[PDB]
Write a structure and sequence with these properties.
The structure is cut from a larger assembly and holds two copies of chain A.
Chain A: E1 2-6, H1 10-13, E2 24-29, E3 32-34, E4 39-41, E5 52-57, E6 63-72, H2 76-83, E7 90-93, E8 98-101, E9 117-125, E10 130-135, E11 140-142, E12 144-148
Antiparallel strand pairs in A: 1-12, 2-3, 4-11, 5-10, 6-9, 6-12, 7-8, 7-10
Protein name (chain B): Hemagglutinin
Organism (chain B): Influenza A virus
Subcellular location (chain B): Host apical cell membrane
Protein backbone atom coordinates (compact mmCIF):
# COMPACT_ATOMS: atom_id res chain seq x y z
CA UNK A 1 0.00 0.00 0.00
CA UNK A 2 1.43 3.35 -1.09
CA UNK A 3 -0.30 6.73 -0.86
CA UNK A 4 1.29 10.16 -1.22
CA UNK A 5 -0.23 12.69 1.17
CA UNK A 6 0.57 16.32 1.96
CA UNK A 7 2.30 16.05 5.34
CA UNK A 8 2.71 19.84 5.64
CA UNK A 9 0.31 21.96 3.56
CA UNK A 10 2.26 24.67 1.79
CA UNK A 11 -0.33 27.43 2.23
CA UNK A 12 -0.60 27.11 6.03
CA UNK A 13 2.41 25.33 7.57
CA UNK A 14 4.97 28.13 7.07
CA UNK A 15 3.44 31.57 7.64
CA UNK A 16 6.70 33.10 8.91
CA UNK A 17 9.07 31.84 6.19
CA UNK A 18 9.18 32.02 2.40
CA UNK A 19 8.22 28.96 0.37
CA UNK A 20 8.48 30.44 -3.14
CA UNK A 21 12.12 31.50 -3.71
CA UNK A 22 13.58 28.01 -3.34
CA UNK A 23 14.26 27.30 -7.02
CA UNK A 24 17.58 26.43 -8.66
CA UNK A 25 18.89 26.08 -12.19
CA UNK A 26 20.21 22.63 -11.24
CA UNK A 27 16.60 21.37 -11.29
CA UNK A 28 15.03 22.99 -14.37
CA UNK A 29 11.46 22.48 -15.52
CA UNK A 30 10.46 23.78 -18.97
CA UNK A 31 13.63 25.88 -19.03
CA UNK A 32 12.76 27.67 -15.77
CA UNK A 33 14.23 27.29 -12.31
CA UNK A 34 12.37 24.79 -10.15
CA UNK A 35 12.77 22.37 -7.26
CA UNK A 36 11.59 18.98 -6.06
CA UNK A 37 7.84 18.41 -5.88
CA UNK A 38 7.87 16.66 -2.49
CA UNK A 39 10.09 19.22 -0.73
CA UNK A 40 10.01 22.95 -0.01
CA UNK A 41 13.24 24.94 0.30
CA UNK A 42 12.36 27.61 2.84
CA UNK A 43 14.22 30.93 2.83
CA UNK A 44 13.99 34.22 4.71
CA UNK A 45 10.80 36.27 4.45
CA UNK A 46 12.92 39.39 4.42
CA UNK A 47 15.90 39.96 6.73
CA UNK A 48 14.43 37.42 9.16
CA UNK A 49 14.42 33.64 9.55
CA UNK A 50 12.55 32.97 12.80
CA UNK A 51 12.80 29.68 14.65
CA UNK A 52 10.98 26.96 12.74
CA UNK A 53 9.07 24.46 14.89
CA UNK A 54 6.71 21.99 13.22
CA UNK A 55 5.29 18.61 14.22
CA UNK A 56 3.31 15.81 12.60
CA UNK A 57 1.49 13.02 14.44
CA UNK A 58 1.03 9.83 12.42
CA UNK A 59 -2.76 9.47 12.32
CA UNK A 60 -2.54 6.90 9.52
CA UNK A 61 -2.76 3.23 10.34
CA UNK A 62 0.54 2.18 8.73
CA UNK A 63 4.08 3.42 8.25
CA UNK A 64 4.87 6.93 7.01
CA UNK A 65 8.02 7.65 5.01
CA UNK A 66 9.16 11.24 5.59
CA UNK A 67 12.02 12.73 3.56
CA UNK A 68 13.82 16.01 4.24
CA UNK A 69 17.03 17.75 3.24
CA UNK A 70 19.85 19.84 4.68
CA UNK A 71 21.47 22.54 2.55
CA UNK A 72 25.17 23.45 2.73
CA UNK A 73 25.87 26.83 1.12
CA UNK A 74 29.29 27.38 -0.46
CA UNK A 75 29.97 30.77 1.13
CA UNK A 76 29.04 32.61 4.32
CA UNK A 77 27.43 35.33 2.20
CA UNK A 78 25.26 32.61 0.67
CA UNK A 79 24.26 31.60 4.20
CA UNK A 80 23.17 35.13 5.11
CA UNK A 81 21.42 35.76 1.79
CA UNK A 82 19.11 32.80 2.47
CA UNK A 83 18.79 32.31 6.23
CA UNK A 84 20.27 35.44 7.91
CA UNK A 85 21.98 33.21 10.51
CA UNK A 86 25.70 32.48 10.28
CA UNK A 87 25.39 29.71 12.89
CA UNK A 88 22.23 27.80 12.01
CA UNK A 89 21.17 24.32 13.07
CA UNK A 90 18.52 21.72 12.27
CA UNK A 91 17.04 19.06 14.54
CA UNK A 92 14.83 16.19 13.42
CA UNK A 93 13.23 14.09 16.13
CA UNK A 94 11.15 10.95 16.54
CA UNK A 95 10.57 8.47 19.36
CA UNK A 96 13.41 6.31 18.02
CA UNK A 97 15.27 8.85 15.84
CA UNK A 98 16.92 12.13 16.81
CA UNK A 99 19.71 13.95 14.98
CA UNK A 100 21.15 17.47 14.94
CA UNK A 101 22.52 18.83 11.65
CA UNK A 102 25.06 21.63 11.29
CA UNK A 103 25.74 23.39 7.97
CA UNK A 104 29.17 22.85 6.44
CA UNK A 105 29.82 26.13 4.62
CA UNK A 106 32.65 25.47 2.17
CA UNK A 107 33.31 25.60 -1.56
CA UNK A 108 32.81 22.22 -3.22
CA UNK A 109 33.82 21.22 -6.74
CA UNK A 110 31.17 22.50 -9.11
CA UNK A 111 28.80 19.84 -10.45
CA UNK A 112 25.60 20.86 -12.26
CA UNK A 113 26.77 24.48 -11.91
CA UNK A 114 26.25 24.28 -8.13
CA UNK A 115 29.04 24.83 -5.61
CA UNK A 116 27.01 24.03 -2.48
CA UNK A 117 25.48 20.72 -1.53
CA UNK A 118 22.22 19.22 -0.27
CA UNK A 119 22.12 16.03 1.80
CA UNK A 120 18.86 14.07 1.69
CA UNK A 121 17.59 12.14 4.71
CA UNK A 122 14.58 9.91 5.31
CA UNK A 123 12.86 8.17 8.19
CA UNK A 124 9.87 5.96 8.98
CA UNK A 125 7.27 7.21 11.45
CA UNK A 126 5.34 4.40 13.12
CA UNK A 127 1.61 4.61 13.89
CA UNK A 128 0.96 6.71 16.98
CA UNK A 129 4.41 8.27 16.61
CA UNK A 130 5.22 11.88 15.78
CA UNK A 131 8.01 13.66 13.91
CA UNK A 132 9.37 17.07 14.89
CA UNK A 133 11.34 19.56 12.80
CA UNK A 134 13.26 22.38 14.49
CA UNK A 135 15.45 24.78 12.57
CA UNK A 136 17.20 28.13 12.41
CA UNK A 137 18.17 27.64 8.77
CA UNK A 138 19.38 25.14 6.18
CA UNK A 139 16.22 23.00 6.17
CA UNK A 140 14.30 21.68 3.17
CA UNK A 141 10.98 20.78 4.77
CA UNK A 142 8.80 17.88 3.59
CA UNK A 143 5.74 18.68 1.50
CA UNK A 144 4.50 15.17 0.65
CA UNK A 145 5.06 12.09 2.80
CA UNK A 146 4.26 8.51 1.82
CA UNK A 147 1.84 6.32 3.75
CA UNK A 148 3.21 2.84 3.12
CA UNK A 149 2.87 -0.82 4.05
CA UNK A 150 5.82 -3.15 3.46
CA UNK A 151 5.80 -6.84 2.38
CA UNK A 152 8.35 -9.69 2.58
CA UNK A 153 10.73 -8.22 0.01
CA UNK A 154 11.71 -7.97 -3.65
CA UNK A 155 14.36 -6.37 -5.85
CA UNK A 156 15.00 -3.77 -8.52
CA UNK A 157 15.49 -4.95 -12.10
CA UNK A 158 17.67 -2.70 -14.26
CA UNK A 159 16.75 -3.48 -17.87
CA UNK A 160 15.53 -2.00 -21.14
CA UNK A 161 13.02 -4.82 -21.71
CA UNK A 162 9.47 -3.64 -22.48
CA UNK A 163 6.73 -4.07 -19.89
CA UNK A 164 3.62 -6.04 -20.87
CA UNK B 1 41.33 3.15 34.90
CA UNK B 2 44.29 0.86 34.18
CA UNK B 3 43.46 -2.78 33.44
CA UNK B 4 45.26 -4.75 36.14
CA UNK B 5 43.06 -7.77 35.40
CA UNK B 6 44.43 -10.46 33.13
CA UNK B 7 41.67 -10.25 30.53
CA UNK B 8 39.40 -7.88 28.65
CA UNK B 9 37.17 -5.41 30.48
CA UNK B 10 33.79 -4.26 29.18
CA UNK B 11 33.10 -0.62 30.10
CA UNK B 12 29.72 1.07 29.63
CA UNK B 13 29.00 4.79 29.86
CA UNK B 14 26.36 7.25 28.74
CA UNK B 15 26.01 10.76 27.34
CA UNK B 16 22.98 12.84 28.34
CA UNK B 17 21.15 15.30 26.07
CA UNK B 18 18.96 17.72 28.04
CA UNK B 19 15.78 19.01 26.40
CA UNK B 20 16.49 22.70 27.06
CA UNK B 21 19.45 24.96 27.83
CA UNK B 22 17.87 25.67 31.22
CA UNK B 23 18.07 21.95 32.00
CA UNK B 24 21.73 21.98 30.97
CA UNK B 25 22.45 24.83 33.39
CA UNK B 26 20.40 23.21 36.17
CA UNK B 27 22.28 19.92 35.82
CA UNK B 28 25.85 20.93 34.89
CA UNK B 29 26.24 24.76 35.06
CA UNK B 30 28.08 24.61 31.71
CA UNK B 31 26.18 25.58 28.57
CA UNK B 32 29.17 24.65 26.39
CA UNK B 33 29.90 21.19 27.75
CA UNK B 34 31.85 18.32 26.21
CA UNK B 35 32.87 14.74 26.96
CA UNK B 36 35.92 12.77 25.83
CA UNK B 37 36.43 9.02 26.22
CA UNK B 38 39.75 7.55 25.17
CA UNK B 39 41.72 4.31 25.09
CA UNK B 40 44.77 3.16 23.14
CA UNK B 41 42.59 2.12 20.18
CA UNK B 42 39.50 4.26 20.91
CA UNK B 43 38.96 8.00 21.19
CA UNK B 44 35.79 10.03 20.78
CA UNK B 45 34.52 13.47 21.77
CA UNK B 46 30.81 13.85 22.55
CA UNK B 47 28.98 17.14 22.43
CA UNK B 48 25.46 17.59 23.93
CA UNK B 49 22.58 17.97 21.49
CA UNK B 50 20.19 20.25 23.39
CA UNK B 51 16.77 20.06 21.74
CA UNK B 52 13.22 19.05 22.65
CA UNK B 53 12.61 15.49 21.49
CA UNK B 54 9.19 13.86 21.25
Amino acid sequence: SFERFEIFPKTSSWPNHDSDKGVTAACPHAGAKSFYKNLIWLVKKGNSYPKLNQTYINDKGKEVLVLWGIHHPPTIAAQESLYQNADAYVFVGTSRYSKKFKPEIATRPKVRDQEGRMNYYWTLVEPGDKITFEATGNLVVPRYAFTMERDAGSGIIISDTPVH
